[PDB]
From a paper:
Human Miro1 and Miro2 (hMiro1, hMiro2, also called RhoT1 and RhoT2) are MOM protein homologs that play a critical role in mitochondrial trafficking38394041424344. Both associate with Parkin upon mitochondrial depolarization and are ubiquitinated on multiple lysines18374546. Here, we demonstrate that the cGTPase domain is necessary and sufficient for efficient ubiquitination of either hMiro1 or hMiro2 by p-S65 Parkin. We also find that despite considerable similarities between these two substrates, Parkin modifies hMiro1 much more robustly than hMiro2.
To better understand the difference in ubiquitination efficiency between hMiro1 and hMiro2, we first determined the crystal structures of the isolated cGTPase domains of both proteins to high resolution (hMiro1-C: 2.25 Å; hMiro2-C: 1.69 Å). The overall folds of the hMiro1 and hMiro2 cGTPase domains are quite similar (rmsd 0.78 Å over 129 Cα atoms). Unexpectedly, both domains crystallized as symmetric dimers. The dimer interface is a highly conserved hydrophobic surface along one face of the cGTPase domain, which, in the intact hMiro1-BC structure, forms the interface with the second hidden EF hand (hEF2). The residues of the cGTPase domain that interact with hEF2 are structurally conserved in the hMiro1 and hMiro2 homologs, and a structure-based alignment of the four residues of the hMiro1 hEF2 at the core of the hEF2/cGTPase interface shows they are 100% conserved in hMiro2 hEF2. Interestingly, although the same conserved residues mediate dimerization in hMiro1-C and hMiro2-C, their dimer relationships differ significantly. We performed size exclusion chromatography with in-line multi-angle light scattering (SEC-MALS) and confirmed that both hMiro1-C and hMiro2-C dimerize in solution. We next sought to establish a structural basis for the difference in ubiquitination between hMiro1 and hMiro2, and the preference p-S65 Parkin exhibits for targeting K572 in hMiro1. hMiro2 contains a glutamine, Q569, at the position equivalent to hMiro1’s K572. Beyond the location of this key target lysine, the electrostatic surface potentials of the cGTPase homologs are also markedly different, especially in the vicinity of K572/Q569. In contrast to the isolated hMiro1 cGTPase, however, the isolated cGTPase of hMiro2 (hMiro2-C) was only weakly modified, suggesting the cGTPase domain of hMiro2 may not itself contain efficiently modified lysines.
Author numbering: 408 to 582, 584 to 587
Write the structure that this text describes.
Amino acid sequence: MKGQTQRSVLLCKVVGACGVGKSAFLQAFLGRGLGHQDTREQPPGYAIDTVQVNGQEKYLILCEVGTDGLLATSLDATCDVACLMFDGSDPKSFAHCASVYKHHYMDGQTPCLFVSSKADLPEGVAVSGPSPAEFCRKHRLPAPVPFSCAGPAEPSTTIFTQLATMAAFPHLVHALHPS
Ligand SMILES: Nc1nc2c(ncn2[C@@H]2O[C@H](COP(=O)(O)OP(=O)(O)O)[C@@H](O)[C@H]2O)c(=O)[nH]1
Ligand SMILES: [Mg+2]
């Protein structure tokens, strides 16, 4: 039917440098913010839970993948959607994240979502250009999504529905004129 897919299980790789918040992001997928985390439920570097996509229950696997040092080149990029994470409070974070995209995903068919982590902290701009938003406009990616794991409030679930939807229907992801 329209809006349905044979896929029951979707794979997202959460790809980013050490310290950008990948492990906390996986915990937030399971409904746990900073401190409220709980390690002994799922394997390290993995988080699985159900996500609704157009009324249908899907399983989304988040798979944590580092990019520090040699990992920036020694990357198995295969996944249904790549979540490219950079530290929104770190001036130097985005450039490394953008380089990973260019070398592994830029001219592929895998949907990519840039995520600006630690949105609760004071923002950290880079000295050179371009901005993360300008980079995504040029390479025709979605606008980078800010995310935060802190606060006493429950973590938002919107970005995980977005990742699951991109994974389920990879041909309807885009940047678009007119809107
Ligand atoms: N303020 C804040 N700190 C965060 C957030 N996410 C992660 N951190 C902290 O940043 C550090 C690295 O996070 P971690 O999840 O281990 O990153 P990883 O190395 O990419 O897996 C830890 O001290 C976290 O508590 C966030 O949204 N806000
Ligand atoms: Mg980690």
